């Protein structure tokens, strides 16, 4: 209908490179230039350059020179963006955007995540004291993402699950909780169903005092 | 190259106010677009070419002016609209973007529910600690966070993390968390969170001594 579908996320080595592809349905390939811009945390967005994939022509942004080398492949419909010596700060989300005019199209963002660190799953804590609250830290993985769910899907209501932190380590820290009557402390059960799909690590935590 | 500042960086407004967020460049251009972003999403296009609208986008979003300066005005805000915004110039390479302008929700001071919870066994087994302080479901944002360790002031050594606003009653909800060794857990006694915010007259201390 017009829609641009980038790969999905990524986690590099320092010093490595990484390949990024956007294909493009709802309009003819070549008739339009396909741009790359970068957001990366406290979101600032930067563009970083086009391909136009009847020449074959490329723009640049000065900035981004040195890091990515854009090509298009006209048989498939889809634009690349390679990014070379990745570094920490190359951590962010990418996007693709059609460049007819401003851009009105853009693909759903790759998250690529550069870092020394290695997969590794979570250990799981638990967080235990009307109402009372509990959770469960989830401490000392690699890379995001991890999804925190309380008794199968049960329970969302009171539920905050709090962005991760990055730990001197270079590994990952989160909590979950939630509040619960106090009356039913010693008697209700309470789980925490962690998954680190990454290291293919799901766990279900009962939480008591 | 072109660089935009926009004004103010963070708003705070309440459902049907005339919000004007400002964008100043740093040398003259010809055209200004604007977009608006959500949380995880690619953003949309709102106003192209300095003032046109795109289609689809309510005609409560405006936008006007020239050279160096250029705003947009939402002049009734509606629900849809707390989000980011930001402005964009396409007029030379490089293809630059205004710094973003955070509009969120006003409403009523809300005191935060404060918890702290202590070390598990489970995890002192490995040789770290992790100490953990919530605040939950308050109003505004700003909230200051003392950790004692028997009455030393902690600084630096604790990292806190926050909710986005909430979707029903705009609150937030806050984890600061302590890290240590084992060992230096096991120096002292009294482990405390100290809880500063304006919908609090004094200060709310929750605290444990480490031994159940």
């Known amino acids: 209908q017009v829609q641009l579908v980038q790969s999905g996320a990524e986690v590099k080595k320092p010093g490595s490179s990484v390949k990024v592809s956007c294909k493009a349905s709802?309009?003819?390939?070549?008739?339009?230039?396909m741009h790359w811009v970068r957001q990366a945390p406290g979101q600032g967005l930067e563009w970083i350059g086009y391909?136009?994939?009847?020449?074959?022509?490329?723009e640049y942004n000065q900035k981004f020179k040195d890091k990515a080398t854009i090509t298009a492949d006209e048989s498939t419909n889809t634009a690349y963006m390679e990014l070379s010596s990745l570094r920490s700060e190359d951590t962010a989300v990418y996007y693709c955007?059609?460049?007819?005019?401003?851009?009105?199209?853009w693909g759903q963002g790759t998250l690529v995540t550069v870092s020394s660190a290695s997969t590794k799953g979570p250990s799981v804590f638990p967080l235990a004291p009307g109402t009372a609250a509990l959770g469960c830290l989830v401490k000392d993985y690699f890379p995001e993402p991890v999804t925190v769910s309380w008794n199968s899907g049960a329970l969302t209501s009171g539920v905050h699950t709090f962005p991760a932190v990055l730990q001197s380590s270079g590994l990952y820290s989160l909590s979950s909780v939630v509040t619960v009557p106090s009356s039913s402390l010693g008697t209700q059960t309470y789980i925490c169903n962690v998954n680190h799909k990454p290291s293919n690590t799901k766990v279900d935590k009962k939480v008591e005092p | 190259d072109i660089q935009m500042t926009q004004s103010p960086s963070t708003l705070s407004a309440s459902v049907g106010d005339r919000v004007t967020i400002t964008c100043s460049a740093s040398?003259?251009?010809?055209?200004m677009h604007w977009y608006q972003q959500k949380p995880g999403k690619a953003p949309k296009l709102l106003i192209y070419t300095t003032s046109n609208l795109a289609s689809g986008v309510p005609a409560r979003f405006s936008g006007s002016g020239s050279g160096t300066e250029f705003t947009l005005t939402i002049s009734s805000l509606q629900p849809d609209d707390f989000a980011t915004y930001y402005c964009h110039q396409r007029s030379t390479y490089p293809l630059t973007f205004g710094q973003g302008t955070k509009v969120e929700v006003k409403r009523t001071v809300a005191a935060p529910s404060v918890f702290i919870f202590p070390p598990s066994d489970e995890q002192l087994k490995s040789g770290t600690a992790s100490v953990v302080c919530l605040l939950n479901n308050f109003y505004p944002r700003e909230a200051k966070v003392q950790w004692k360790v028997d009455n030393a002031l902690q600084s630096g050594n604790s990292q806190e993390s926050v909710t986005e606003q909430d979707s029903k009653d705009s609150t937030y909800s806050l984890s600061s968390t302590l890290t240590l060794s084992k060992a230096d857990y096991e120096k002292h006694k009294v482990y405390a969170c100290e809880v500063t915010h304006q919908g609090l007259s004094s200060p709310v201390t929750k605290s444990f001594n480490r031994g159940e």
């Open positions: 955007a059609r460049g007819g005019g401003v851009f009105d199209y």
């Open positions: 391909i136009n994939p009847s020449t074959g022509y490329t």
């Open positions: 709802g309009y003819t390939f070549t008739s339009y230039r």
């Open positions: 040398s003259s251009i010809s055209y």
